[PDB]
Structure 1
Amino acid sequence: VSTFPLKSDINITKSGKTLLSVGQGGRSSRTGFTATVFGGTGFLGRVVVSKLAKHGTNVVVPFRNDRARRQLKVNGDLGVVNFVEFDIRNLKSIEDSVKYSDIVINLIGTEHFSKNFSIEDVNIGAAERIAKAAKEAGVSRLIHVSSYNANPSSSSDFYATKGIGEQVVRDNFGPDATIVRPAPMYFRNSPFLNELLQIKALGGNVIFKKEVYPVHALQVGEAIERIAFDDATAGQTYELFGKERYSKKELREMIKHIIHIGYYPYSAGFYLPAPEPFLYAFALIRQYISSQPRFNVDQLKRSHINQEIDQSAKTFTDLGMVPDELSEYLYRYVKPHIQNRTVYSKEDIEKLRDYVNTP
């Protein structure tokens, strides 16, 4: 960001287009690109879209929810943010969002299968159609986002399909495609944190014993931004994660202690020891009775699997960015949910973390 994102004013894409950026990088400036951000209306998209538009890149955001795309237009200027109605089952609408696009970003990825899509149909079927269709329109660069633990042979549906999503893209878009693996990001209304703040978290012991490498969502938002303007980063695999290792159960008590939540945790439902069959049965029952995406069977297995760093991939420093730690930002993102306010600074998170580990 700073004042101007582009490294050089004139950039030539892989397709021979010669794009000249104008202006000093303000709202009324431009960069001559057209970055189609699939799944832009999601949690991750609203950061990817926001950074691209403010610096003058045209953003084509294909949406399926009409009332969620309205707020994305504030970020850009007049004509900067464009909208296309689409569904992954409508091939023609896909080709409307890639015809004029020089950058194509893929963010579509689900954890719960619905009555219209399975986990494979989205992490693969959407990705395969999106990647292959983009190539036929002469898209210069493709960027993809997968799980942080992609594995073709994993028994977890999410990790198995996300891994195959990496293969099927590279057999469709080709060598130019890029794959970026984000660690669980934390931000306002982050799905990673929304499970920790929920008071009635059945199976809290089982769900929160998993391990992670939390990463600030803004940096990943800029991580795609750095990759977008550069052609040197084609055909790579990137895994983005935070230095200091944290576990959900370590966070859950750390989160609760900041909110100061005697008898209350024992009664309101903070700790709900429930049998393993009951958790498996409850998730299956809601899967046919619920109407909103609930806790899934897949996240019962993932809770037993810890995050794995892959050494074949490249870190933040490969892009010149130093990742930020959850300690410097965990307090502010739960500040909404918390005499004299005690602000738990960066260093003081350890002293909180110390208080959790002490029996």
Structure 2
Amino acid sequence: LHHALIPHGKGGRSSVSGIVATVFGATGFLGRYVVNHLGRMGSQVIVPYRCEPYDTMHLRPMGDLGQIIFMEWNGKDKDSIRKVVEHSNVVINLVGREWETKNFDFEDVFVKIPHAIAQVSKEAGVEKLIHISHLNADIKSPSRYLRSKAVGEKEVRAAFPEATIIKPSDIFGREDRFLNYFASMRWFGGVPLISLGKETVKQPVYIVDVSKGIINAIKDPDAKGKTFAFVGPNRYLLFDLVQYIFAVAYRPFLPYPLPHFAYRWVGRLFEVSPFEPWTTRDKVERVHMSDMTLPHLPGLEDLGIQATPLELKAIEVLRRHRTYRWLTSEMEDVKPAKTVN
């Protein structure tokens, strides 16, 4: 180890943890949580950004003086990728869009970019690579999102054989899509569900658990070239999950069955927006798809993290969606949803 990479302190804000990490996609949900945990440890963090610098302001307080470094980056520019991974011994990849824009596709953001990041990082001598994939990453999956996820996972494993591929199920948190996507269907009358959501089983995972698992993957020497599956402790049907979401948000729950082709056309309607779409066809497919069971792969209990149940952290996300009449209602006022274990 270099004399400047030896850990010192008590793992506080002003300590030295010996970790120099370049976090791609640090300007998002999982990105902000991972950067916060690294800065809390007292690590050196490099944040490649392509957006407006104003949109990276929430990441400034997360580390001490000089512990957060912001650099521009393209994604199609291996020179920029080398510039941002040149001096770091850990490279974390959380780049990804749930939709497709004019300039970037699912092939671009899930196969081309991760492969270039892994290829450059291998040349630059980066010791550790963490790559975030999806739990339902199937090559023959109906969703192009998941097809590209599987292809990019294979490409990353090929380019950087000593990688840690993490496969979260469905991350819920304050800034997530999942709980907010289900809780924002108040505006469109009722809740459209495919087969009334009785044929879909999901086990969401908590954002803090995912970030802690990513951190512990860096600090574990026996997770170098592995694949993890981050899942929650309980599995729910989609109908019961959405019903519990609306119960906690204290909104009237009016489900109705919508045929799959009709839902696909509805999703096609919403994806014409130049801005961030409310829903897309791939989002509809991913919501309908059941979470896979992967008992062979390790998980949070193996990385040392006890998974947080949804019934303990749902009220953080869903209290914002309540009205004035129900803002002050307590956490225990809603009976937990029916699980399928």
| TM value normalised by structure 1 | 0.85
Matched, 1:90 2:74: no
CA distance in 2, matches of 1:289, 1:232: 45
1:193 maps to which residue? 179
CA distance in 1, matches of 2:230, 2:273: 37
* Change beyond 3 A, Cα 1:172–1:181: same
Who wins on radius of gyration, i.e. which is larger? 1
Matched, 1:220 2:210: yes
2:159 maps to which residue? 172
Match of 2:215, SS?
helix
Match of 1:68, SS?
helix
Matched, 1:79 2:63: no
Match of 1:219, SS?
helix
- Contact between 1:38 and 1:61, CA under 8 Å: does it hold in 2? yes
1:246 maps to which residue? 236
Structure 1 unmatched runs, 5+: 1-11
The one of 305, 327, 331 aligned to 2:311: 327
Amino acid at match of 1:144: H
Equivalent positions of 1:109-258 (< 5 A) are 109-173=96-160, 175-198=161-184, 199-201=186-188, 204-206=192-194, 209=197, 210-258=200-248
Instruction: Provide Cα deviations, 1:128-176, integer angstroms capped at 9, x if missing partner.
Output: 0111111110000001110111112223211111111111011111x21
CA distance in 2, matches of 1:40, 1:176: 22
| TM value normalised by structure 2 | 0.89
- Contact between 2:193 and 2:258, CA under 8 Å: does it hold in 1? no
Matched, 1:316 2:300: yes
Amino acid at match of 1:249: F
Structure 2 unmatched runs, 5+: none
CA distance in 2, matches of 1:50, 1:304: 32
Amino acid at match of 2:20: T
Equivalent positions of 1:242-281 (< 5 A) are 242-261=232-251, 271=255, 276-281=260-265
CA distance in 2, matches of 1:170, 1:316: 21
Instruction: Work out the number of aligned pairs and report it.
Output: 332
CA distance in 1, matches of 2:235, 2:206: 13
The CA RMSD measured in Å over matched residues stands at 2.5
1:23 maps to which residue? 9
2:39 maps to which residue? 53
More moved, 320-329 vs 159-168? 320-329
Q: Post-superposition shift, 1:331?
A: 2.0
Equivalent positions of 1:58-69 (< 5 A) are 58-66=44-52, 67-69=54-56
